[PDB]
Amino acid sequence: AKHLFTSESVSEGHPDKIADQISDAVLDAILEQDPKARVACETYVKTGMVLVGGEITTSAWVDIEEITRNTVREIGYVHSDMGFDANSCAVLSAIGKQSPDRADPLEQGAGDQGLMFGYATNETDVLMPAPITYAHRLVQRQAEVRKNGTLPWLRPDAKSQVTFQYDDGKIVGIDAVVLSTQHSEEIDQKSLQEAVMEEIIKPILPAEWLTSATKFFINPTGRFVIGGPMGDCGLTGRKIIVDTYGGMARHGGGAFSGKDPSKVDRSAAYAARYVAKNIVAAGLADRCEIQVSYAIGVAEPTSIMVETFGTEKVPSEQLTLLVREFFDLRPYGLIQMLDLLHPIYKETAAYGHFGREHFPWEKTDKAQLLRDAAGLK
């Protein structure tokens, strides 16, 4: 049966992502010097202004200003006529520093409560929903061609949204595509439309999916010239769905960036991506969504639900069974199973935390063991 579904993505340099990247840049920077630092670092950015505020608990000494400005420059906001300059905006910070003050460390309990969700589906090479995969790929492409002089009239800020029509479970093709890139005053709009069609859209989207019918909307309102923080507000934790799975699978409250791995909100979610992906690369089901939860000071998850939406090749009790045998879902266990105490996190902060294959949670190393304990098959 037909039905359509949509998902959105935004580039590096959309204001909430500028915030996400800065936070994580500070997370990495401390993790480089002190892999066991506790950090929670929420950023806010606004037209003149980056306020990076935190509670951090570490040895490390790190230069918030310098870190901030460098990140703003990588994204490329470097002159007042863009809307924001990395070399002259104000960076205020408000980071409270705490200097660091059971038998089996794996038994330490959850830092805070929470529910968190993970998905995979075999609809993609990366085991991700197609819409969120393609939306991310449009916006990536736009930062790519910007950065590499191909299309150098184009400025950082940009959104993509792709809407896919499916008949039963099966992607039929692409009903609409929308892309809106900040660009210089130099280029004008029909010429831009050809360019993004040539260079961002046609080389990313599968042709078989595009038809005579695909409604494309490229800068629909025209002249997107000042963007980024100018006239807008980024805060960490706002593009929370884009981070995940574009609205295909569910979400607990929680944001990732600027939280170190002791934070279940990040880790437990990475681990759930990891269990669900392994469940599917193993041929245990076609789609798998999984809810974990935790309660403060208990170590075991208060809840595990698995939902393979009628797509299992083994009954489900047996599934949740081996969910538990192959995975240490306790707070310190996650951190062990995925080897998290490293400065890996800024790369996460833009184009999808998931679907991207060199992160510890994307590897399908438990594939076979899951298969051949799922009976033997």
Place this chain on the structure above:
Amino acid sequence: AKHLFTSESVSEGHPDKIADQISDAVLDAILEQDPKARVACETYVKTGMVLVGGEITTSAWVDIEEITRNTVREIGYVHSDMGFDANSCAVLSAIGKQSPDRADPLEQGAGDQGLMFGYATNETDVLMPAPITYAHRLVQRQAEVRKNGTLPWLRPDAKSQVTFQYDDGKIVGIDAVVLSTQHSEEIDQKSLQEAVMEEIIKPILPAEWLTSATKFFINPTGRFVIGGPMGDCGLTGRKIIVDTYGGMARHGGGAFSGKDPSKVDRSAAYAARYVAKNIVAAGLADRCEIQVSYAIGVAEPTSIMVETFGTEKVPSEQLTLLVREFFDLRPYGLIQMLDLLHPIYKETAAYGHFGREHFPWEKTDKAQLLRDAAGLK
């Protein structure tokens, strides 16, 4: 089949909610004077500090400081030993003001792109998932008994999380309950546990659902004495799931508070709650989730999906059909259908935007017409 599911809520005065309430307090305050003001007003609160920053476009003159402080006082943070004082914290603001500069206004296009989701299910009197209903009810109760001198040793900040076990679709009962209230240095912990059991938990949760087996965790880590902004960070748009449906139904990126109704992220989501609830009070299905999307400058939604998860009493094409006949889903249509240009919004900012019955989107006024166009039945 058994499986469990969890949802979380937080009180007024959890820091992200303090932010949510302040933003919305400014939204209402302008809407009182200028119902057509465009406002987007993101707040950030941190130990000394409320930064309320915005882009606003209105006639209205309003006192951000005074508004902020009053809201902080209603929640009750009123003395340094709580962690935050409404009468002496600093309120900085950064609001850019713009003074206001097609044939059928209903045809004006979407302000921005987005996907948004709505749900109902007949699992509750209010047509909401039970977990998110009960979690909100625990935290409400805790603000209630605090505020009305029953339990006056208790301070604002608090979280609840309830985990429900279901056999097929049918709530069986409550596996675990967690509640963690900030409290004065006066009361200690065993005495507090009796009190919250007597006065917050036993009078809110259905008894038939509680058993011999219900794992209750009340202040698990003990002594929650300073809370609110002290040592933490609120930002608007962080308790985004709690706002919705606790993780039962899906989410687009988007936050509500501090956005006026021209903002699809709010409105379209309220309208989706409205269509889905009417679909179920009409007996068209048991659970209905609905995805709407929009693209910038188009007026019609780019996408409508309805998902009545095998629970329809009419086939689905016919459903999406009458989804379209009974509802004006265009940006200005939503605003018409739900009569939004009023100062109604601060009440939204704490305990659930939905499930709460005197908001324009909760009324089931299209009930019958939907029934008797759904064939006649």
